[model samples]
Target: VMKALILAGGSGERFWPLSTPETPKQFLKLFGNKSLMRWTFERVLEEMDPKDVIVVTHKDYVERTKKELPELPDENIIAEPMKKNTAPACFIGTKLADDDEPVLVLPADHRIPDTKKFWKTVKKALDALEKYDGLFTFGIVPTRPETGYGYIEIGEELEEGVHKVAQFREKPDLETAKKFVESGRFLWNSGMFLWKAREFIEEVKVCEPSIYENLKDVDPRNFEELKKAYEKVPSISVDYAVMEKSKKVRVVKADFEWSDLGNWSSVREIEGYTEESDEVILVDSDRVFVKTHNKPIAVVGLSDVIVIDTPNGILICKEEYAQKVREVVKKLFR
Candidate 1:
């Protein structure tokens, strides 16, 4: 059995108005009736022992995570002390795993509609780990010239669907993205990774020695001591800190209709979510989504716009401006 460490500590500022500081996008029921966290829990638990799966979230959301994943034992939910981009959280999960089972590190807020295909890909990635002591990342076949997400360049082919990671490309400019799409080598970085806990520690020792030294000695279960350890370690992404530096980096081509649900526009792209409400009257309004807390409302002559109406904060913006929604949040705070 494999261990799943679901990382759920993102602020998700891009999904503001509906997703606030208290309730980030992971807790938001933007996709279906249930929250993304709950959905992720159910999906993983279907194929895994409830005990084998773990969730690491912020201290603020410890209780919330338990509430969302009632099937999982309370002890399985780890309340990480701080928000240090992924390396600390992964370290905690790596240390928490009791056995030699490889850990599947995944974000709680991705959309993988095909469960069978997803699990199949996961199994393939896990299988690759057995052949070589490599940090495995699930790579999605690029659908379009997507500039919002990172890309993985394929290196030497190890198997039918597995390949050594040639390079990890950051989110590129429009022209670079186009060129990447034109070439038959790039895939979207799916952000889901698989690795053995001990091997990960070995790579961390070489790549991020400070983090390796800081996190290696401390008992992760000891929350206070771990907090002190985290303070000494530098804040860095798992990709930059470990995967990029590690010689044993592999990418598995796992095209399973994945989406990060990055912004309102992605939500708009999902069908059946843009239906006009009975409480709202749409007069000459097309491509407009007026949702959340449906009250008597009239939208006149609006197109390609989204209305995320909530008592906490109502966000009305043009569809193209979806990515800039976080800017609104920043301005509000400033």
Candidate 2:
């Protein structure tokens, strides 16, 4: 059976005040109605079973994951003991499955607005992989010169909805990003992947021997031990250790709407904010997002700012300084 592994281990400090260590961005309903993780869980489960979906989150978030996704089996949630990035977590999660089964790896915090097309696109990639022995990634169609997100150059177009990955580029400077967008061959690296469990392990074995060694051990029925083994692996992203370095990587053009919901900028884009309508209230600020439904906040003439009041904490900063918002929370040192 095909399975899924959702990486929910992020401490989204960038969305700070709203995103804390114990209660991060993934747990919040950043878009609408449900939390990001819940949306992802329900979206992916449409194609597979909850038992086949392993939700990998930090040890601190186990209870929250349970509370949010009660339908999933308790054993399906794999809580990491320490902070090992997506690469190691992939090893642990994939190792939990059978070698021949297909697996789709996904991030818990991304927002994809169109699910019908999204699932069909993923199914196409899975079908392609079942026939072809290579790694697959879902790449977003680039709308602008986005410096904040990683970029992938599409080579030859494969059928109507897929393409070959020529190269993976780091988040480029504004000028470089613009050129990339103008070239019309670049796509946003969304980090969604589909592959056979054994194929991924074999690729990791040759590419990241140290990490692969740490997570290669198998205990299919024991997710707790799987989490513990992953703790010893280094905190490196899959792109750094394998995808970029591997020649077997390919990309599938996404058919649905997708957004990272990362920075306030991305959030603003998804929420559809403009100079029109009193749908938003600005308080002593210029070019900032102050979201609240409880009460109105009063602020003086502040420039380029963001003020957010959550149940946990209140954040105030210049819009340009929003990227550093997480550092403020980290200073709590609790």
Candidate 3:
């Protein structure tokens, strides 16, 4: 059986005041009534055991997580001693599981519309890992030209839903992204992976000595002992530390509607904003998200804009400039 691990320590500063230093977007009910993390857990549980699913979050939010997920075993929720990026976070998670158990890794904040297809693809990937002995990832079949996402090129079809990874490209410029979409051989890197815990650790240890060495002593069963080991690990994402250099990697085609939901533009696009407005929608509104606020936010004489007013903060931005939001949020600390 495979255990699911959700990486939940991201600082959702891109959403600004709505995503504070303390409560980030994953903990916020950005999609609907349930928090993003809660929604992700629920979806995964359709095929996974609730007890087998673990969440790794920052130490500060440990109490908040408990209140939100009371059914989870206290030991199931792991808190980082510090904010080490996805590489170290996943290493520790893999350590917690049984040696032979397969691990399903997730971002904890993405939105996937097709839950049934997701589980089907995931199971296929898990089965592939046993015979293939490689790191497997789910790649979303691209529907449009999206520069915000990384692209995974498919080499050859290995099976019905499996393929050899030809290449992994960084988030491209607009023109390149469009070309990729047109090529019909590219998929959006879903950032979700399935692997045997023991073998995956070995792959990381061989690929990134420094990162793997830092995580060498971390034990998932003992919280106090794990914290001591985490104190020595550096912050690094899984891509930088391992995947970028690993030769043993595979991409499984995931037939699911997905989005990382990294910024406001993604939210606006997903909501299907257009010029035409119905009686239910305010008239004369330009390209705007127009979610509920203290007052009806009307965009007059404006175009290509996103206006999201949360209880804590408001996000206003142009579609293309959304990625630079981190820079603006970084300045808030200064």
Candidate 4:
């Protein structure tokens, strides 16, 4: 049986004031009443049993996750002692079951509106795993030259909707991004992956031996001991540790609505400007978005600015500088 693991460990500092250390963006309700984490599990539940779904998150948010997802068994919400990045999370998630079933790894805060198309694409990837020996990652068909995202260069077609990975490119500048878009072979790296649990573990052994070795002896049944074991694992993304090193990598072309929701700019693009209450007003301002829990806000003659108000602090920046919010978050915590 196939299982799913949702990675929900990031601090999401880009969403700063709104996403704190105790509660990250995945636990917040950006669009609707339900949190993004809830949406992620709901999507996976479409093709998987609740018992087969696992959420890998930080130790701090374990109780909150349980509260948010009461339908899931307590063991399903695996909490790490600290953040060791994606490599350890993947390794730990794969260790949940000793079987050779395929595991689908997904992010908790991504927004994919088209559930039907999303499931269809995932099923294709899962099916491909049965016949191929390679691990698969989803690549969203690019609609724009987005510098914020990493790009995957597609190689020879492995099948109708899948392709062998030619190369993995880092985030590029505006000119290079435009070139990638114009070349017509690049897809935005969606960070979603499908592979047999044992196959990925084998690849980790071959490519990232240190990660494999450090985590190889971990005992999942012993929670306190497992957390201590994780402290020794190095911090590295799966892309850097395995995908970049392995030749057996493939990308599935996904034709579904997807957004990582990395920052407030993405939120504005999806939800649009909102005047949620009559207390807020915009005068002669264009492309301004504001999210306030309390107190009224008024913007005048400001264009492309974002105002985020919370009990912690208020953030005001040009929409173009939304990504830089992480820097502000760093300075605050530093």
Candidate 5:
């Protein structure tokens, strides 16, 4: 048996305005008609029952998450009383499981176009889990020297598709990223993980003893208790807490077209609606992105620009500065 844990608690401030903290990026229908979290749920739903799947989000989002995923049992959707990053989310998700079945943890907002190819790799990794009892992560073959993503260097192969993780590098400088890509030994850490429930908590116990002790008695079902437990635990990411420290970590080569869809530029790169939408009017404009509210939008003489016209806010920025979109939100709230 397998369990799917979808982490949808991020503020997703990078998409801004259209993707405000109120709605966030995961809730927005950026790709097609469905929200990113909904698409994530559907992907896992194809392989498991709704009850076997879990969602960990902020307390503020429980109602909205429930509304979007009515078929999912409300008991399974967990709301974090506090934010201590992915470590707590993963720990809580794995702890709530009734069995020691394999848990697959995935971020809610990412652009993965080929579900078949993605699932094929996921299935292979799941198979490897039974063969070798190690913490597993889905690592993407790098298409570029992306400074935005963490890199995983693979060491010796444990089997056909699984390899012992050599090193986990944080977001590198351009020079280091280029060198990593050139070495052909690096994978963009995709943040998709697989491990048995008890095994994952055991690793956390050894790796982060303080967290283990502080959160040991907190019940996952009770919100106020989870809040009190979180106050005593140190804030840290799962990568820093377990994956990077443990010797039992393994990486599975995931062969799928993937992107974090971090900004407007990346959202443009996915190409579901750049030029083909009837509402988009592109006259002599090249490589321009426009997303309006189903109204006629025109770009007479623009190139490499992004125009997002949402009710509360509008964004008009060059594609090169797409990473700065988060700053727009910071400025707005200031």
Candidate 6:
């Protein structure tokens, strides 16, 4: 049996004005009138049983998660008291399943146009998981010289769609990103992964023993204990904690239309936003995107920029520097 685990602990600070601590981008209906998290859940439900779908989110958003995903039972929503990054979320979510089947960990705030094709690729990975003895992650075939995403150097092809990962590269400089894009072997790391429960637990035991030690005894049935257990876990991504260190990692090439939706610019790209609607107006502006509710916005003489308006505040930045929105958020906290 295969289970779907949605990691929903992100604050989405980059989406500041529209995304707040109380309600982040994942919960926003930034797309077609449905929250990204709900879309993610529905995408998984297309292939997996509702009972088998689990969501790992912050304690504050548990009720909201339940309200958004009424199909999922209370037990399926695993809430953590604190944010400990992906490693602990993956570890604890996989551990909470209390089963030996393979678990698929996916972020709650991504966009996939073809749900059918996405499931087909997921089925391939699941089959690979059953046959392979290592962790499996999808690598998107690079369509551009994107410096915002991590890259995977694909090695020997093991099966039809699966390949051995030669190396994992972090976000590179513009020159390096162009070179990687030119290299046919490099693929954008999608962060979605598949692994057998027991196998991943063992890998965590060996690679991130400190994290495993802190989360090993956590029981999802007991919320108080689970909360306490997360307090001692360090904030480290699964990429650094295990995937980067493990030799038995595999990358599956994915060709589906996918976007992490990390910023408003990507949203414009995926949603194909034009200023024809009443909500937005653009005059002599090239590549300017606006996202707001009720308030009418007009962008004139601006190119390659994003405008976001919300009750919290407003954000306007060059499309290229959209990723730097987090820096602005950091300054606010300081």
Give all TM-scores, in the order shown: 0.92, 0.87, 0.88, 0.92, 0.92, 0.91
After aligning candidate 5 to the native by TM-score, how far in Å is the CA of 238 from where it should be?
A: 0.9
Each prediction's number of clashing residue pairs: 0, 3, 0, 0, 0, 0
Residue-wise lDDT of candidate 1 within 1-334, one digit each (tens)?
A: 5789999846577787877754677888876799988888888876998989888878888888888888888888777677788887888788776546799998999888888888988888888889976889888778788886778889999987889988887677889999998898988888888898888877888888888888888876678997888888888888778766678789988857877898888887875336566776788888787775857666799888888788768888898899898888788767
* Per-residue alpha-carbon lDDT of candidate 2 for residues 30-144, written as tens digits (9 for 90 to 100): 7667999999988987777788999877778889999999989988887777777788778878888799988899998888877899988988898788766678988887887
lDDT of 3 by residue, 8-62 (tens): 8466777765677545668867777888888888888788777898888777877
CA lDDT scores, all candidates in order: 0.81, 0.78, 0.77, 0.84, 0.84, 0.83
Candidate 2: what lDDT? 0.78
Task: List ranges where model 1 is wrong by over 4 Å.
Answer: 272-280
Cα RMSDs, all models = 2.1, 3.0, 2.9, 2.2, 2.2, 2.4
Candidate 2: which stretches are off by over 4 Å? 172-178, 220-228, 274-288, 298-305, 311-313, 332-334
RMSD of candidate 4 to true structure, Å = 2.2
Residue 284 in model 3: lDDT: 53
Residue 25 CA error for candidate 1 (Å)?
1.7
TM-score of structure candidate 1: 0.92
Full-model lDDT, candidate 5: 0.84
Clash pairs for candidate 5: none
Give lDDT: candidate 4, residue 33. 88
Per-residue lDDT of 105 in model 1: 94
lDDT tens per residue, model 4, 1-334: 8888889846678887877843577887877788888888888877778999888887878898898888899888888888878888888898776557988899898899878899998888878888776889899878788886778889988788888988877677889999998999888889888888888999999998888887887865467877778777788888878887788889988869888987889999997886635867888887788987777898888889999999878999899899999899878887
Q: What value of lDDT does candidate 1 attain over all alpha carbons?
A: 0.81
Instruction: Predict model 3's lDDT versus the native.
Output: 0.77
Q: Is candidate 2 or candidate 6 better by TM-score?
A: 6
